[PDB]
Amino acid sequence: TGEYVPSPSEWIGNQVAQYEASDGAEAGEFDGRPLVILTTVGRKTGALRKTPVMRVEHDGRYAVVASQGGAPTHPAWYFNLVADPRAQLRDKDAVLSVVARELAGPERAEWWERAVRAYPTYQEYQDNTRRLIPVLLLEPG
Ligand SMILES: C[C@H](OP(=O)(O)OC[C@@H](O)[C@@H](O)[C@@H](O)Cn1c2nc(=O)[nH]c(=O)c-2cc2ccc(O)cc21)C(=O)N[C@@H](CCC(=O)N[C@@H](CCC(=O)O)C(=O)O)C(=O)O
């Protein structure tokens, strides 16, 4: 409870670790594009959970996209946000307290365009799912 428990994936855990140790100077990009670290509260364990995701930024808001590399199912961090939308978003040296809001309609469309601009592969994922990919807006706390 309130304790960070890393992803069981050694590679993900290791990427979170290097990013935090270096303010994103290490492990700060994937596919040549910037990452941020999302911290959520585990809805079952109360553990703090930390997840690298693509950076998608505008006016101090961040959108996070629950694509899980084009996996069929939602990732755990998505359920965590639905249970408690409070999160931390680390972008390099800045650590923001934010609250998540899942997007729909024209607002979603706007951030989806921003997300695909940032990481075109997201469109490939959506094309390959019949389920709408969750896009959550992280707003300043
Ligand atoms: C593997 C799983 O992680 P996850 O939360 O499902 O997240 C899956 C992935 O999205 C996560 O690995 C992302 O970091 C992958 N990922 C991206 N994932 C994305 O979805 N979008 C991205 O843009 C993205 C970019 C990215 C860039 C670099 C990189 O290295 C990884 C990237 C996990 O940690 N499972 C834990 C539990 C985690 C958890 O939060 N448990 C909750 C309960 C959750 C529940 O109720 O089911 C708790 O503790 O209470 C476990 O099995 O022990």
Residue numbers in the entry: 6 to 146
Give the text the authors published on this PDB structure.
In order to characterize a full-length enzyme including the N terminus, we also determined the structure of nfa33440, a homolog from N. farcinica sharing 42% sequence identity to Ddn and that was active in the PA-824 in vitro assay. The structure of this protein was solved by molecular replacement using the Ddn structure. Although an initial apo structure lacked density for the first 37 amino acids, a cocrystal of nfa33440 with F420 confirmed that the overall structure and coenzyme binding are very similar to that of Ddn (rmsd is 0.95 Å over 109 aligned Cα atoms to Holo-1). The N terminus of nfa33440 is represented in the electron density starting at residue 6, showing an extended sequence packed against the core of the protein followed by a short α helix flanking the F420 binding site. Although interpretation is uncertain without assigning the spectrum, these data, along with the lack of density for the N terminus in the apo-nfa33440 crystal, suggest that nfa33440 in solution consists of a structured core with the N terminus undergoing conformational exchange processes similar to the Ddn mutants. In the lowest-energy model, the nitroimidazole group of PA-824 is located near the Re face of F420, with the nitro group H bonded with the side chains of S78, Y130, and Y136. Notably, S78 in Ddn and S72 in nfa33440 are bound to a water modeled near some chains of the crystal structures (shown for Holo-1, chain E in Figure 3D), which may mimic binding to one oxygen atom of the nitro group of PA-824. Mutation of S78 (nfa33440 S72) resulted in loss of activity, as did perturbation of nearby residues likely to help position S78 (Ddn R142, I144; nfa33440 R136, I138). The proposed role of the Ddn Y130 (nfa33440 Y124) hydroxyl for substrate binding and orientation was also substantiated because mutation of Tyr to Phe significantly lowered catalytic competence in either enzyme.
